[PDB]
Paper text:
In contrast to most DapA enzymes from Gram-negative bacteria PaDapA is not a homo-tetramer but exists as a homodimer in solution and in the crystal. Size exclusion chromatography suggested only one species with a MW of 60 kDa, i.e. a dimeric structure. This finding is also consistent with native polyacrylamid gel electrophoresis, which only showed one species present in solution. PaDapA is also a dimer in the crystalline state, where the buried surface areas at the dimer interface are 1500 Å2, whereas contacts to other subunits in the crystal lattice involve surfaces of 300–400 Å2. The reaction mechanism involves a covalent intermediate formed between the substrate pyruvate and an invariant lysine residue at the active site. The reason for the ability of the PA1010 knockout mutant to grow in the lungs of infected animals remains unclear, but our data suggest that DapA is not a promising target for the design of novel antibacterials against P. aeruginosa.
Randomized transposon mutagenesis screens had indicated several genes from the diaminopimelate (DAP) biosynthetic pathway to lysine in P. aeruginosa as essential, suggesting the corresponding gene products as potential targets for new antibacterial drugs. Dihydrodipicolinate synthase (DapA) catalyzes the first committed step of the DAP pathway, the condensation of L-aspartate-semialdehyde and pyruvate to 4-hydroxy-2,3,4,5-tetrahydro-L,L-dipicolinic acid, which is non-enzymatically dehydrated to yield L-2,3-diydrodipicolinate. Tetrahydrodipicolinate N-succinyltransferase (DapD) catalyses the transfer of the succinyl moiety of succinyl-CoA to the α-amino group of tetrahydrodipicolinate, the first committed step in the succinylase branch of the DAP biosynthesis pathway present in most Gram-negative bacteria and mycobacteria.
Residue numbers in the entry:
A (entry chain A): 1 to 291
B (entry chain B): 2 to 291
């Protein structure tokens, strides 16, 4: 089921920037062992922007083939061209993905109607479940709740990753969509509150490094155990903050390399975490018991 | 590379196919009306929805028609350094005089990552390169300290500053060498950026008012503030209405109304909403374009 703690998985690169399949296999085994509910491969945390079409499908198949159906595998397949998004989404389907996550078009600032038409088009073009993703702090556009509600009535559009961290927005979306349309957090610091409001999962950067804790956090929030959920969240807060001290996924790749899970590669225009940021993150990782 | 530089639309037919005859009409319109350069396949040209093959073909077609009469600048930015290098290499082979490279959108690089991205591209491809800062689209802002660093890299010849912030414009102009040229990417304020020492405007409004834009840039660049401002003030209703919905949705409606292009635009962009037709039509009539 496409709910709970879903890791926004990094894509590990060796120091020359090439895909590191051995390291990817370690990460997939770690999630399998620690209670992660789903894996999101080749999204923003996975450096979607710097993977070419051939690499995008390679990663998806390698994750799908290793997971062997044990938990869902969701593929990032958004683009700011409708045509490209269709091609990425068809590739995910061919690759064996259970669902796709599609960011709102970045850069070109479509109207709300253009957002509707874009997602309506992709939903009809490719028969795979699709999850919308609203992150205005990256895309420079905001899919408003009225538009989310319209798309919630389309076949194959199963939910939304809402990344604004605006809990008034979360509540408005949750109120306006059917109970079958699931609202997931895209903001690790506030995800507990979004799930307590009725959301059904967290597509999480923190989960890369604290998957068991995040799995426990989502389960607690999702059953309404507010005290338990907030307790884990409050303990993780320094790590949620540190993991965005420079743009995600720079901090989390540093953290995963410190854990011995991945190599030091990251592709331009992203850079390895600045040394001025290493202390706050290392401290958070020790404090939460991750390292 | 200076003056009124049109941020040229890419015309499509009703089924979304490239309309080469319409493109040629537009290039002739600019040649006749005093436009000083053409920026092909940028933001106003729907770079996002052109595939690699289409991108280069548009550049090739514009270059070949222009025949050296005015500079042709190609939009070649990307949010992957690897992609940006390929676009830039392609434009150079295609005969572009320069390339315009947006700062990486969506993935929010650090300032150091911006430096390394642009310096890599400037080393990789021997074609003049113009930086492009537009935080309202990219969700990152290239700060003047980074602009200055890059202004020392060979091959990096200028910057299109689209923030509309004239204190930002002044800071950039003061920090960089007199050889590194600062161009406006905000039509409403471009006149002031040129009066501050900027050297052109990479303009949406020039698509529909090329003569007026050319006259405005020439006045601003020789320091005739009164004449530059009077032209700009005249055009202001059009500058505003051309962003009533995200550019290039309004300007494509305007160019179709003028009879210059067909009514095609590629998803996720949509044809101008009906409620926006009147204010734009009125602004075009007020300003003498229609
Ligand atoms: Cl971030
Ligand atoms: Cl706009």
């Amino acid at each position: 089921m496409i709910a709970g703690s879903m890791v926004a998985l990094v894509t590990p690169f060796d120091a020359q920037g090439r895909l590191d399949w051995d390291s990817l296999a370690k990460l997939v085994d770690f999630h399998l062992q620690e209670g992660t509910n789903a894996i999101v491969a080749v999204g923003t945390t996975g450096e979607s922007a710097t993977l070419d079409v051939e690499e995008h499908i390679q990663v998806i198949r390698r994750v799908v083939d290793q997971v062997k159906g044990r938990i869902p595998v969701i593929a990032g397949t958004g683009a700011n061209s409708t045509r490209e998004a269709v091609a990425l989404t068809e590739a995910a389907k061919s690759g064996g993905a259970d669902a796709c996550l599609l960011v709102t078009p970045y850069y070109n600032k479509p109207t709300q109607e253009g957002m509707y038409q874009h997602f309506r088009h992709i939903a009809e073009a490719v028969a795979i479940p699709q999850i919308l993703y609203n992150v205005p702090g990256r895309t420079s556009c905001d899919m408003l709740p009225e538009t989310v509600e319209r798309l919630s009535k389309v076949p194959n559009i199963i939910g939304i990753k809402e990344a604004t961290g605006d809990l008034q927005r979360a509540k408005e979306v949750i109120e306006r969509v059917g109970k079958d349309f699931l609202v997931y957090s895209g903001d690790d610091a506030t995800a507990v509150e979004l799930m307590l409001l009725g959301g059904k999962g967290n597509i999480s950067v923190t989960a890369n490094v604290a998957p068991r804790a995040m799995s426990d956090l989502c389960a607690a929030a999702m059953r309404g155990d507010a005290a338990a959920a907030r307790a884990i969240n409050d303990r993780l807060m320094p790590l949620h903050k540190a993991l965005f001290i420079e743009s995600n996924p720079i901090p989390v790749k540093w953290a995963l390399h410190e854990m011995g899970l991945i190599p030091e590669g990251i592709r331009l225009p992203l850079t390895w975490l600045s040394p001025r940021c290493h202390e706050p993150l290392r401290q958070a990782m020790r404090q939460t018991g991750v390292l």
